């Protein structure tokens, strides 16, 4: 184990939650992962370092940095904490304009279609595909297993292309069966 460092710049809009969630973020990194944690208030970037005498797992530093990045993108703390717990969790990321060049009201309505009324539509994809989705304006981030995120991605893409929520909800249910069956 060698002395190493990471630098993850947290955007301004995620600063206050980080101040909110700080009491629950350094314990797992400094105890279980045995890592040395800070941020530079001047640079507003959370700095994470491998402590050679105490850190033991070679992959802890990358695991911690990725855990931070999940929180930075907008994922809830408990959702991000799983990345520390597990080792096969990844983040899929893409924008609306990649699927279709939607502008003005068309872009806004496409976002509304993904989220659904009261967030129901996003939650169905969340539950059915066993993933988590953060919809940041036209920027979509999906966290989950590699097979799972691909399944969640297409349901989002179908909604972007114009598939009504109702039929997407039905397709999610057929997919939900095969997940429990396997």
């Amino acid at each position: 184990i060698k002395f190493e460092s990471r630098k993850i710049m947290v955007p301004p809009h995620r600063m206050t939650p980080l101040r909110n969630s700080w009491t629950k973020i350094y314990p797992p990194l400094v105890e279980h992962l045995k890592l040395q944690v800070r941020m530079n208030l001047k640079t507003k970037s959370v700095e994470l370092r491998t402590n050679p005498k105490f850190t033991t797992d070679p992959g802890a530093l990358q695991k911690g940095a990725d855990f931070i990045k999940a929180f930075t993108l907008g994922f809830d703390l408990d959702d991000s904490i799983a990345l520390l717990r597990l080792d096969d969790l990844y983040i899929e990321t893409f924008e609306v304009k990649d699927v279709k060049t939607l502008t003005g009201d068309h872009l806004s309505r496409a976002i509304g279609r993904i989220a659904g009324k009261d967030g129901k539509t996003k939650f169905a994809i969340e539950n059915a595909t066993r993933t988590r989705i953060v919809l940041a304006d036209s920027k979509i981030h999906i966290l989950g297993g590699f097979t799972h995120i691909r399944m969640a991605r297409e349901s989002v893409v179908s909604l972007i292309l114009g598939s009504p929520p109702g039929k997407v909800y039905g397709n999610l249910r057929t997919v939900a069966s095969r997940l429990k069956e396997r």
């Binding site: 700080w22 009491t23 350094y26 400094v30 040395q36 944690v37 800070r38 941020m39």
Partner: peptide, 8 residues
């Protein structure tokens, strides 16, 4: 807060 601005 531990670690807000100093090594922790």
């Amino acid at each position: 807060l531990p670690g807000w601005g100093e090594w922790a």
